[PDB]
Design a protein around this ligand. Structure first.
Ligand SMILES: Cc1c(C(O)=C2C(=O)CCCC2=O)ccc2c1C(=O)N(Cc1ccc(OC(F)(F)F)cc1)CC(=O)N2C
Ligand SMILES: Cc1c(C(O)=C2C(=O)CCCC2=O)ccc2c1C(=O)N(Cc1ccc(OC(F)(F)F)cc1)CC(=O)N2C
Ligand SMILES: [Co+2]
Ligand SMILES: [Co+2]
Lengths: 380, 380
């Protein structure tokens, strides 16, 4: 049941912004590891004396990496005279965020019809304001409200090239890397208490609950066409094996974004390319399931995937889950940085053709039990 | 003239330590960009609840990348019970350093015969103490004094594998990258006033002055065998074109390490490999000289380098300088991070065979004028 209760018009995920200590090194690492190209910049060379911001793109996926300069470079400025291209940026907020949480997602940005109205309606409906609507060059409006922890939900709306003040990147620096990633499928938060988190976010967005012992309870909020998907997890406590949600909250100093799920047009090629680069600057992947897991795949998805396609999953460590509607291929990186906090999921969905409807195949929750079984079975 | 006046026995450069916001992402970027392998770690997986530290090696070159965890993980600890493998580490010092200077070198470490005696003699002779001598596992002693700005000179001495508490890295993560870099040739500081900086450092080390308008004055301090080389620069002010030393001091919030010079066993192969990777996660290089610079090379080094070897320099943007003793091939990266502060130099030296004596060919100071001339000549 989709009651289509969005309180404002939401379009798609727009971008994800990482707050960094050094944006250059994080962005270069991510670019090589994920196959995203450098597409825009806002920094000293564009007249920004406040923050360094670099944009990577792959298909429709946009990753933004931002770090503060010395406040001394902009000490003469006031907000009316700022050279920052992202007016919500604040040196002290950014340093406090990074000291508290380490490397992670500050902003989950969605494109909306009218960011000012989305902001007003959100706050009218319980949203805690974070940055008021600001119109950039009479062309783009941006506004921010609190989502969970120190993560903000950022609204962006265009009258009619990322943001004013960003420059498109010189082709010599823009190497056309592409490993097949195409868009953000969902963005997931970890919180101490799921109930209040859900009530708050669904309260101010109108997002509805999307239809669904090892660590967590979770629920998923979705926009009208279910293309914006925001799962939220809470720990289950005292569980024999320690909850990965609780470990997150400890090392992150509280709630924050747990993982970003990146849809690939060809997950086999994406994983081949990412795995070639794991030990030369890219990303590592979580330990693969035992062969029993892939022996058990035939009985569960043998009508969706051929033997060769199942064997290809086994080579790459890919996990498979299935719903009543569709099938999900997925795999998880190790944490992106020093702390066991944020990681990335690569996914591809099979089914639900209408275009493909959102959330086709679910989020892989069936893989908790099927993994656990596989390990005890393989213990043989 | 080498009066060999070291006040304690100094051996070689040992390692360079970067203080980072996220050590994982900086270390992965540097590993790919410079061809250094992951050789040791000290982090949560080794029982360190204080800091994440990763060591890259190439030949004798050791780069250490360190970042703090949440203080909350180690809140119960006191220095006698610390899980930190580097006892001089301090959460607050590290966050203050990074907020103030951005990504950069905290420690220039040299191996000495006896770090405790080097520390005592240094402080007896004017050195400002930074961290007192601490013996690690009855095997290694480490101590630190202030060098310039917030950079420390770290003494390390071994009774008889990097440091106790570091683990050697799992071979699956240790991809044997190697682009030819072999050791640290020299480490260079920028200061507001050269005179007091020289007097201070030469005062407590016994290092002697090593024998030598566009931006700077400089002087070089050297150990007895001139294998530890510490150049120091100061700006020249009001100079038509802005001093790169002054730009450094502005963006770095004062004095700090300007560049690390990395000797290559084969600078042509190193530059080929680094340049292939510039736009896919590695390092960029400063703008190459015009062809007039390479036309003028024949008259200056045609007895050292063949036409093919000179043409190979031209393909790679390599600079050449020469002394009365030897010849220097060199080239400079763009800044390593967001701020126009620290960069890296790749070098190879020809001549001074005895082994090769240190500083053979100088530091490239003749390339300031020869570059400037080349640009005006090429303006034609
Ligand atoms: C984050 C995550 C998702 C996931 O995407 C979401 C959502 O999107 C929304 C709904 C909640 C949800 O969680 C889906 C599957 C998943 C993980 C995952 O984090 N992990 C780490 C992990 C845990 C337990 C473990 O032990 C064992 F139980 F044996 F596997 C080993 C690794 C491992 C793992 O295996 N799967 C299969
Ligand atoms: C740091 C540095 C060294 C260097 O290693 C040291 C030492 O080790 C110890 C002794 C002091 C010393 O400086 C040597 C050569 C060098 C640079 C350098 O930083 N730079 C940037 C730069 C400046 C001016 C410029 O304009 C023009 F003058 F036309 F070139 C363009 C780029 C450029 C450049 O060209 N050379 C040739
Ligand atoms: Co997921
Ligand atoms: Co140099």
């Amino acid at each position: 049941k989709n009651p289509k209760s969005d309180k404002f018009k939401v379009k798609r995920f727009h971008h994800i912004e990482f707050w960094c200590g050094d944006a250059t090194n994080v962005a270069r690492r991510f670019s090589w590891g994920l196959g995203m190209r450098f597409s825009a910049k806002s920094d000293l060379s564009t007249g920004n004396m406040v923050h360094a911001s670099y944009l990577l793109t792959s298909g429709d996926l946009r990753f933004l990496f931002t770090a503060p300069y010395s406040p001394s470079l902009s000490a003469g400025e006031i907000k009316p005279t700022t050279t920052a291209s992202i007016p919500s940026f604040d040196h002290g907020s950014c340093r406090s965020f990074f000291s508290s949480h380490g490397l992670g997602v500050r902003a989950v940005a969605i494109e909306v019809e009218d960011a000012e109205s989305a902001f007003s309606i959100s706050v009218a409906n319980g949203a805690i304001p974070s940055s008021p609507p600001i119109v950039l060059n009479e062309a783009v409006t941006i506004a921010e409200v609190k989502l969970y922890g120190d993560v903000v939900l950022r609204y962006v709306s265009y009258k009619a090239e990322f943001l004013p003040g960003f420059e498109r990147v010189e082709d010599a620096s823009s190497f056309p890397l592409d490993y097949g990633i195409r868009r953000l499928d969902h963005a997931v938060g970890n919180v101490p208490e799921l109930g209040p988190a859900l009530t708050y976010v669904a309260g101010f967005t109108g997002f509805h609950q999307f239809a669904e012992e090892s660590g967590l309870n979770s629920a998923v909020l979705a926009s009208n066409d279910e293309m914006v998907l925001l799962p939220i997890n809470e720990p289950v406590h005292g569980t024999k094996r320690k909850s990965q949600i609780q470990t997150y909250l400890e090392h992150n100093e509280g709630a924050g974004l747990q993982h970003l799920a990146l849809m690939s047009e060809d997950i086999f090629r994406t994983l081949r390319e990412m795995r070639k680069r794991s030990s030369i600057g890219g990303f590592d992947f979580m330990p693969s399931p035992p062969p029993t897991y892939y022996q058990n795949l035939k009985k569960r998805v043998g009508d969706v995937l051929s033997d060769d396609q199942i064997k290809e999953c086994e080579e790459l460590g890919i996990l498979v889950d299935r719903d009543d509607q569709g099938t999900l291929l997925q795999i998880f990186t190790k944490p992106l940085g020093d702390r066991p906090t944020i990681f990335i999921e690569i996914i591809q969905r099979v089914g639900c053709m209408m275009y493909q409807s959102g959330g086709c195949g679910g989020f892989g929750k069936g893989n908790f039990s099927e993994l656990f079984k596989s390990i005890e079975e393989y213990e043989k």
